[PDB]
């Protein structure tokens, strides 16, 4: 018997009081600019958004985003989370200026606001998420192993409920932020922005010259002579003809891939969540930009 999570709105909140909590985000990810050589915290806060909700089983509804589980110790110890503690301490003043807002609906909507803030596509988010006990974290090791091949890749994602074109969609990601080898065992940038949300992730895989080598912790990655990385299961985007289809979609049109990622991004940050008949319709925050802040 799959659990059932309800969407429950926080006491009396309405879209006003999430655009200032958006707004908090957004101007701290603006102040706290040295952070990681410079990129700042907008790409481990989607990473932080991505692995508090791709922990979720579509078989039995546990893991996911609704709990907030990522606050408990288990969790925010998995290996595979190695790193996210600077995601967690920079949502701290957030929480405490908020607390109000569920630790769901803060994990959630970090990734939101820096994939917005980093010039991405609008990513609609809803409301109440509710936290859960401790007992409800789940176990380590429902995340990724990045040393694996496309038919891992499309296997694992099935378990989130992910085809071949949202996985595709959902890895563009990979534009943002770098491997770190202490973090993960890999070390470097899948390109040059690193904090602008654009499709350089695909243009990289598909005209890069990419060798395949060793790192300095003895794992394969695949590297080029404008010193960015694939991990193996980037690479095997292009090594799957299903997936490099969708690949060569995604690195000639621009704007379809925000589509494509905003729709996926919203269902991963979703997946599990039972929204009420009567609940509000999913809110589209403004950028400081937008709102001339
Ligand atoms: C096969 C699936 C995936 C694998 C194996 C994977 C693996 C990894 C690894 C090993 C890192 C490096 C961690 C570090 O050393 O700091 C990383 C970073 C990152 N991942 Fe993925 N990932 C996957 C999918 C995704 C998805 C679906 C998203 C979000 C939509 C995402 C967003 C990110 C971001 C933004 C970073 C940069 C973090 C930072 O710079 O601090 N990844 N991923």
């Known amino acids: 018997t799959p659990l059932v999570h309800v969407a429950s709105v926080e006491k009396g909140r309405s879209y006003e009081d999430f655009q200032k909590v958006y707004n908090a985000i957004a101007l701290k990810l603006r102040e706290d600019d040295?952070?990681?050589?410079?990129?700042?915290?907008?790409?481990?806060?989607?990473?932080?958004?991505?692995?508090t909700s791709g922990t979720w089983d579509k078989h039995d509804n546990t893991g996911g985003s609704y709990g907030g589980t990522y606050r408990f110790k288990k969790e925010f110890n998995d290996p595979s989370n190695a790193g996210l503690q600077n995601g967690?301490?920079?949502?701290?003043?957030?929480?405490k200026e908020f607390p109000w807002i569920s630790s769901g609906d803060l994990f959630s909507l970090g990734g939101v606001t820096a994939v917005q803030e980093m010039q991405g596509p609008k990513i609609p988010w809803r409301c109440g998420r509710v936290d859960?006990?401790?007992?409800?974290?789940?176990?380590?090791?429902?995340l990724p192993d990045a040393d694996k091949d496309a038919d891992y890749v499309r296997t694992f994602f099935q378990r989130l409920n992910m085809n071949d074109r949202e996985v595709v969609a959902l890895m563009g990601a990979h534009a943002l932020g770098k491997t770190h080898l202490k973090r993960s065992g890999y070390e470097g940038p899948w390109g040059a922005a690193n904090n602008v949300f654009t499709n350089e992730?695909?243009?990289n895989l598909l005209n890069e010259d990419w060798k395949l080598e060793k790192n300095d912790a003895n794992n394969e990655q695949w590297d080029s002579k404008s010193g960015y990385m694939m991990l193996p299961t980037d690479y095997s985007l292009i090594q799957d003809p299903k997936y490099l289809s969708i690949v060569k979609e995604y690195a000639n049109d621009q704007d379809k891939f925000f589509k494509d990622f905003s729709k996926a991004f919203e269902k991963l940050l979703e997946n599990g969540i039972t929204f009420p008949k009567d609940a509000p319709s999913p809110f589209i925050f403004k950028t400081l930009e937008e709102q001339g802040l």
């Not at 040295?34 to 692995?51: S, T």
């Not at 967690?88 to 929480?95: D, G, R």
């Not at 859960?132 to 429902?142: C, M, Y």
Request: aromatic share 18%; proline share 10%; glycine share 8%.
């Open 201 to 203: 992730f695909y243009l």
């Open 88 to 95: 967690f301490k920079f949502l701290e003043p957030i929480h």
């Open 132 to 142: 859960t006990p401790e007992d409800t974290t789940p176990d380590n090791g429902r």
């Open 34 to 51: 040295e952070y990681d050589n410079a990129i700042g915290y907008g790409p481990v806060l989607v990473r932080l958004a991505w692995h």
